[model samples]
Target: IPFTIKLKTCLKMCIQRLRYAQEKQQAIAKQSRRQVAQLLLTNKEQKAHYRVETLIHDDIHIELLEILELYCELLLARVQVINDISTEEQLVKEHMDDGINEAIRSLIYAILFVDEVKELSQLKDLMAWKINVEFVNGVIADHIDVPEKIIKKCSPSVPKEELVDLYLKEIAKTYDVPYSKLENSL
Candidate 1:
């Protein structure tokens, strides 16, 4: 598929949107924590009602953050595909034989022959391309709705697994309101 400038620009813009949502939600969650402490010391009566209210709002903020994280999850794929589109043409062509008689090395392969000194930029591009390709390939095979699969496949060891984990189960609970959080038959 052609990676039009329009599509690339929009995909980059998408990460910004998800990032902004993440921080805004974080700010609210942070504010809730501090708010609870102040209420505890100053006005104990308000604390009773405010505590539950705070929990509700705080949980909501957390969920929004999780959703933004999941949004980031998919956006990572967008970025990966963007990276793939930007680099894949040469990577694939170099792997296949040139249709013409004599073959000119594509950037992907030409770099292999360059002196170590001259290979920095070429090596860097390939390195970035490889990691992206691997992650994108992993994502393609992962389960979007199988919470554990998504987190484990993407981050720091299993406990960060727990971070996205708690959020996933919470999300699974309320998700029934709007959608059942698919484990689609497909």
Candidate 2:
């Protein structure tokens, strides 16, 4: 007979695994239900099903990553447009606010799949960067008294790579994830 464990036992084991260490948490987080079952079951057929599910999950994650990157790219392009066009302040504010709202909604959607993706940290970093841009724009739109110096200082800089690095560093510190692991997730 195949070895069996109760669902509660499996969940307990999963929680223990999650808390063990970063590497272990990462490993446990990557697996689908089949992989989890294989880890907890001794039966060959059961393990086989899990292996198949893992493969399927891998493809799903890849697709999710692609969708996320595409969405970010689209948002960034719009940011450039918002910066370039010099319409009335009212029109600009409307556009920026709409973009901010849209980006936030899309971000929430992407976050729903964060655990399913291999680049969980990358997703987190990307979303943070986008939200940072949106928030800064929103602030500019809302604050007419905002000084030119303050605006220039807060504006998106030319070296986006450096900004992304700094953003990820702050994020890692805030969330207590290893900097190296978070950086490597990109």
Candidate 3:
């Protein structure tokens, strides 16, 4: 129920342990504010006051960065998982939750409001999450195993309904049923 526990569990569900561990650290390390605020230090008082803070030293900022990193990791992990056939075996129902929805929302808020261009890397990740969520929701709604090929065909740009068409076409081939008939039934 807590954020940390929820994030750890979610990461495990979405990706392999090795990948998760690697990316977890990478995520934390990758987050940074690139913009440098130049401070005039000609005066002794100004020179003495000028200092930059690392994320580790600030609890709130560190937490935000960590969460942002986790979301980025999730996005990367999900993309990798979708690309790797082996990852399909790691999928678990427990990892799916409303909590992730909140996390995702929060992540987007940070990306959009806090830092857009700096967080631009997360844009595709966010898109992947949306596609993944829709794909999962569709699978749950229809109670079917969507072919990996069909899923691969999906993108943030493509309509989710297109998958339905592909699925029906695939089903018709598998069952030797008429695609026209399936469409009629729908």
Best candidate per TM-score, number? 1
Off by over 4 Å in 1: 1-5, 51-55, 72-186
What TM-score against the true fold does each predicted structure earn? 0.33, 0.30, 0.27
Tens-digit lDDT track of model 3 for 106-163? 3434433233234333332533453455434334344234333222322112334444
Per-residue CA lDDT of candidate 1, range 67-129, in tens?
A: 433443443344434344344345345323321101111112222222222422332343345
Model 3 residue 67 CA deviation (Å) reads 1.6
Best by lDDT: 2
For candidate 3, the per-residue lDDT at 103 reads: 35
lDDT of 2 by residue, 1-186 (tens): 111122223223323332343344345445543343333333344443344344444444444444444444444445434333333343346655555334323333444334433333332343335334444344334533333332332332344444434543443455465444554532
User: Which pairs of residues have clashing backbones in candidate 3?
Assistant: none
Candidate 3 lDDT (Cα, 0 to 1): 0.37
